[PDB]
Protein backbone atom coordinates (compact mmCIF):
# COMPACT_ATOMS: atom_id res chain seq x y z
CA UNK A 1 0.00 0.00 0.00
CA UNK A 2 1.18 3.52 -0.87
CA UNK A 3 -0.94 6.29 0.66
CA UNK A 4 1.32 8.91 -0.94
CA UNK A 5 2.97 12.05 0.36
CA UNK A 6 1.91 12.73 3.97
CA UNK A 7 -0.30 9.65 3.65
CA UNK A 8 -0.12 8.21 7.18
CA UNK A 9 -0.59 11.55 8.93
CA UNK A 10 -3.57 10.34 10.97
CA UNK A 11 -2.21 6.83 11.54
CA UNK A 12 -0.21 5.69 14.55
CA UNK A 13 3.53 6.35 14.70
CA UNK A 14 4.21 2.64 14.29
CA UNK A 15 2.08 2.58 11.14
CA UNK A 16 3.50 5.89 9.88
CA UNK A 17 7.04 4.51 10.28
CA UNK A 18 6.42 2.43 7.13
CA UNK A 19 5.91 5.56 4.99
CA UNK A 20 9.28 7.17 5.80
CA UNK A 21 10.63 6.72 2.27
CA UNK A 22 7.64 8.61 0.79
CA UNK A 23 7.81 11.98 2.55
CA UNK A 24 11.61 11.92 2.16
CA UNK A 25 11.39 11.42 -1.61
CA UNK A 26 9.12 14.41 -2.33
CA UNK A 27 11.03 16.64 0.12
CA UNK A 28 13.59 17.95 -2.40
CA UNK A 29 11.81 17.34 -5.74
CA UNK A 30 14.63 17.32 -8.28
CA UNK A 31 12.69 40.17 -14.68
CA UNK A 32 10.70 39.90 -11.44
CA UNK A 33 8.04 37.26 -10.68
CA UNK A 34 10.63 34.70 -11.79
CA UNK A 35 12.78 35.34 -8.71
CA UNK A 36 9.73 34.48 -6.61
CA UNK A 37 10.40 30.79 -7.19
CA UNK A 38 14.18 31.21 -7.15
CA UNK A 39 14.35 32.55 -3.59
CA UNK A 40 11.84 29.88 -2.55
CA UNK A 41 13.69 26.92 -3.98
CA UNK A 42 16.88 28.35 -2.50
CA UNK A 43 15.29 28.38 0.93
CA UNK A 44 14.05 24.88 0.06
CA UNK A 45 17.56 23.55 -0.45
CA UNK A 46 18.84 25.46 2.58
CA UNK A 47 16.14 23.75 4.67
CA UNK A 48 17.12 20.42 3.16
CA UNK A 49 20.83 20.79 3.85
CA UNK A 50 19.94 22.06 7.35
CA UNK A 51 18.11 18.84 8.15
CA UNK A 52 20.83 16.79 6.45
CA UNK A 53 23.46 18.51 8.61
CA UNK A 54 21.55 17.69 11.78
CA UNK A 55 21.08 14.11 10.51
CA UNK A 56 24.82 13.89 9.81
CA UNK A 57 26.40 15.33 12.94
CA UNK A 58 24.32 12.87 14.99
CA UNK A 59 24.87 9.10 15.20
CA UNK A 60 22.89 8.40 12.02
CA UNK A 61 24.27 9.64 8.67
CA UNK A 62 22.36 6.77 7.10
CA UNK A 63 18.95 8.43 6.74
CA UNK A 64 15.45 7.11 7.48
CA UNK A 65 16.20 5.36 10.79
CA UNK A 66 19.11 5.11 13.21
CA UNK A 67 19.46 4.09 16.85
CA UNK A 68 21.18 6.01 19.63
CA UNK A 69 22.75 5.46 23.05
CA UNK A 70 20.55 8.03 24.81
CA UNK A 71 18.33 6.97 27.75
CA UNK A 72 14.71 8.04 27.34
CA UNK A 73 14.05 10.59 30.07
CA UNK A 74 10.75 9.93 31.85
CA UNK A 75 10.07 13.68 32.10
CA UNK A 76 9.69 13.79 28.29
CA UNK A 77 6.09 12.59 28.58
CA UNK A 78 6.55 9.23 30.30
CA UNK A 79 4.61 6.94 27.97
CA UNK A 80 4.88 3.22 27.25
CA UNK A 81 6.15 1.41 24.15
CA UNK A 82 2.66 0.18 23.24
CA UNK A 83 1.05 3.53 24.08
CA UNK A 84 3.15 5.51 21.56
CA UNK A 85 3.46 3.35 18.43
CA UNK A 86 -0.11 2.03 18.70
CA UNK A 87 -2.00 4.98 20.23
CA UNK A 88 -0.46 8.28 19.04
CA UNK A 89 0.11 10.20 15.80
CA UNK A 90 3.32 12.01 14.90
CA UNK A 91 1.60 15.41 15.13
CA UNK A 92 0.27 14.61 18.60
CA UNK A 93 3.68 13.38 19.70
CA UNK A 94 5.57 16.40 18.38
CA UNK A 95 3.03 18.63 20.14
CA UNK A 96 4.09 17.22 23.51
CA UNK A 97 7.83 16.89 22.85
CA UNK A 98 8.15 20.40 21.37
CA UNK A 99 9.65 21.58 24.68
CA UNK A 100 12.49 19.04 24.69
CA UNK A 101 13.38 18.74 21.00
CA UNK A 102 16.24 21.25 21.31
CA UNK A 103 17.51 19.58 24.48
CA UNK A 104 17.60 16.15 22.88
CA UNK A 105 19.24 17.66 19.80
CA UNK A 106 21.95 19.02 22.08
CA UNK A 107 22.36 15.63 23.73
CA UNK A 108 22.68 14.03 20.25
CA UNK A 109 25.15 16.28 18.44
CA UNK A 110 27.48 16.93 21.41
CA UNK A 111 27.36 13.93 23.77
CA UNK A 112 27.56 11.26 21.03
CA UNK A 113 29.66 11.62 17.86
CA UNK A 114 32.10 13.94 19.67
CA UNK A 115 32.87 11.41 22.43
CA UNK A 116 32.13 8.24 20.42
CA UNK A 117 34.28 9.01 17.38
CA UNK A 118 37.18 10.12 19.57
CA UNK A 119 36.75 6.84 21.42
CA UNK A 120 36.99 5.05 18.09
CA UNK A 121 40.14 7.03 17.30
CA UNK A 122 41.54 5.60 20.52
CA UNK A 123 40.29 2.09 19.64
CA UNK A 124 41.52 2.14 16.02
CA UNK A 125 45.17 3.05 16.71
CA UNK A 126 45.91 -0.26 18.47
Amino acid sequence: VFLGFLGAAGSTMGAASMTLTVQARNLLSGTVWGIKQLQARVLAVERYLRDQQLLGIWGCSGKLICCTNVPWNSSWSNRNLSEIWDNMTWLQWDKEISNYTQIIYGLLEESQNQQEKNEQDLLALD
Partner: nanobody
Amino acid sequence: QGQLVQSGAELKKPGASVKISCKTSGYRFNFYHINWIRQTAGRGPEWMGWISPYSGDKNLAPAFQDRVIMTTDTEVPVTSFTSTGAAYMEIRNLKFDDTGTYFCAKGLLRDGSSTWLPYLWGQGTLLTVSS
Protein backbone atom coordinates in the same frame (compact mmCIF):
# COMPACT_ATOMS: atom_id res chain seq x y z
CA GLN B 1 -8.40 10.41 29.04
CA GLY B 2 -11.92 11.39 28.01
CA GLN B 3 -15.42 11.02 29.43
CA LEU B 4 -18.36 8.74 28.58
CA VAL B 5 -21.88 9.74 29.68
CA GLN B 6 -24.81 7.36 29.15
CA SER B 7 -28.55 7.96 29.13
CA GLY B 8 -30.76 7.74 32.20
CA ALA B 9 -32.16 4.54 33.66
CA GLU B 10 -35.35 3.37 31.95
CA LEU B 11 -38.09 0.84 32.76
CA LYS B 12 -39.23 -1.43 29.94
CA LYS B 13 -41.86 -4.18 29.81
CA PRO B 14 -40.89 -7.59 28.38
CA GLY B 15 -41.40 -7.77 24.62
CA ALA B 16 -40.49 -4.15 23.89
CA SER B 17 -37.12 -2.67 22.91
CA VAL B 18 -34.81 -0.10 24.48
CA LYS B 19 -32.08 2.16 23.07
CA ILE B 20 -29.25 3.14 25.44
CA SER B 21 -26.99 5.99 24.34
CA CYS B 22 -23.33 6.69 25.19
CA LYS B 23 -21.95 10.14 24.38
CA THR B 24 -18.17 10.49 24.48
CA SER B 25 -15.97 13.55 24.68
CA GLY B 26 -12.34 14.47 25.14
CA TYR B 27 -10.78 12.26 22.45
CA ARG B 28 -11.17 11.18 18.84
CA PHE B 29 -14.36 9.10 18.74
CA ASN B 30 -13.39 7.31 15.51
CA PHE B 31 -9.96 6.11 16.71
CA TYR B 32 -11.29 3.59 19.26
CA HIS B 33 -13.91 0.85 19.32
CA ILE B 34 -17.11 1.07 21.37
CA ASN B 35 -17.73 -2.10 23.37
CA TRP B 36 -21.05 -2.87 25.10
CA ILE B 37 -20.84 -5.12 28.19
CA ARG B 38 -23.79 -5.95 30.45
CA GLN B 39 -24.02 -7.43 33.94
CA THR B 40 -26.97 -9.29 35.49
CA ALA B 41 -27.37 -10.91 38.91
CA GLY B 42 -27.88 -14.40 37.43
CA ARG B 43 -25.40 -14.73 34.57
CA GLY B 44 -22.57 -12.49 35.78
CA PRO B 45 -20.46 -10.26 33.54
CA GLU B 46 -21.27 -10.80 29.87
CA TRP B 47 -19.68 -9.14 26.85
CA MET B 48 -22.31 -8.14 24.31
CA GLY B 49 -20.28 -6.76 21.41
CA TRP B 50 -18.27 -3.96 19.88
CA ILE B 51 -18.44 -1.55 16.96
CA SER B 52 -15.78 0.51 15.15
CA PRO B 53 -17.00 4.09 14.44
CA TYR B 54 -14.63 4.53 11.45
CA SER B 55 -15.92 1.77 9.14
CA GLY B 56 -19.15 0.63 10.79
CA ASP B 57 -17.93 -2.91 11.23
CA LYS B 58 -19.61 -4.69 14.15
CA ASN B 59 -18.89 -7.86 16.11
CA LEU B 60 -21.74 -9.13 18.30
CA ALA B 61 -21.72 -12.12 20.61
CA PRO B 62 -23.65 -15.21 19.40
CA ALA B 63 -26.01 -14.72 22.37
CA PHE B 64 -26.94 -11.22 21.14
CA GLN B 65 -26.58 -12.00 17.43
CA ASP B 66 -30.31 -11.77 16.63
CA ARG B 67 -31.71 -9.04 18.91
CA VAL B 68 -29.10 -6.24 19.39
CA ILE B 69 -28.41 -3.39 16.96
CA MET B 70 -25.41 -1.07 17.44
CA THR B 71 -25.34 2.35 15.75
CA THR B 72 -22.87 5.23 15.82
CA ASP B 73 -23.10 8.87 14.78
CA THR B 74 -20.50 10.85 12.87
CA GLU B 75 -17.57 12.47 14.67
CA VAL B 76 -17.93 16.13 15.60
CA PRO B 77 -14.44 17.69 15.62
CA VAL B 78 -13.63 19.90 18.62
CA THR B 79 -9.83 20.22 18.45
CA SER B 80 -7.21 18.62 16.22
CA PHE B 81 -6.78 15.63 18.56
CA THR B 82 -10.00 15.58 20.65
CA SER B 83 -13.67 15.37 19.71
CA THR B 84 -17.19 14.50 20.89
CA GLY B 85 -19.29 11.61 19.59
CA ALA B 86 -22.26 9.43 20.44
CA ALA B 87 -22.87 5.67 20.20
CA TYR B 88 -26.23 3.94 20.61
CA MET B 89 -27.49 0.40 21.07
CA GLU B 90 -31.00 -1.02 20.71
CA ILE B 91 -31.86 -4.32 22.40
CA ARG B 92 -35.18 -5.88 21.39
CA ASN B 93 -37.19 -8.83 22.75
CA LEU B 94 -36.60 -7.93 26.39
CA LYS B 95 -36.99 -10.71 28.97
CA PHE B 96 -36.85 -11.01 32.75
CA ASP B 97 -33.18 -12.04 32.71
CA ASP B 98 -32.15 -8.82 30.92
CA THR B 99 -32.46 -6.71 34.09
CA GLY B 100 -29.07 -5.35 35.11
CA THR B 101 -26.44 -2.71 34.44
CA TYR B 102 -25.32 -1.96 30.87
CA PHE B 103 -21.92 -0.34 30.29
CA CYS B 104 -20.26 1.24 27.27
CA ALA B 105 -16.48 1.09 27.04
CA LYS B 106 -13.79 2.78 24.96
CA GLY B 107 -11.24 0.67 23.12
CA LEU B 108 -7.67 0.35 24.35
CA LEU B 109 -5.40 0.89 21.32
CA ARG B 110 -5.69 1.67 17.62
CA ASP B 111 -3.45 -1.12 16.30
CA GLY B 112 -2.17 -4.38 17.73
CA SER B 113 -3.72 -7.52 19.20
CA SER B 114 -5.85 -5.66 21.78
CA THR B 115 -7.32 -2.74 19.84
CA TRP B 116 -10.95 -3.32 20.85
CA LEU B 117 -10.14 -4.14 24.48
CA PRO B 118 -12.43 -2.13 26.80
CA TYR B 119 -10.28 0.50 28.54
CA LEU B 120 -12.30 3.61 29.45
CA TRP B 121 -15.76 2.79 30.77
CA GLY B 122 -19.00 4.59 31.45
CA GLN B 123 -21.03 5.04 34.61
CA GLY B 124 -23.58 2.42 33.46
CA THR B 125 -27.31 2.48 32.82
CA LEU B 126 -29.59 0.31 34.93
CA LEU B 127 -32.23 -1.48 32.84
CA THR B 128 -35.24 -3.01 34.58
CA VAL B 129 -37.55 -5.37 32.68
CA SER B 130 -40.72 -5.81 34.73
CA SER B 131 -44.49 -5.89 34.30
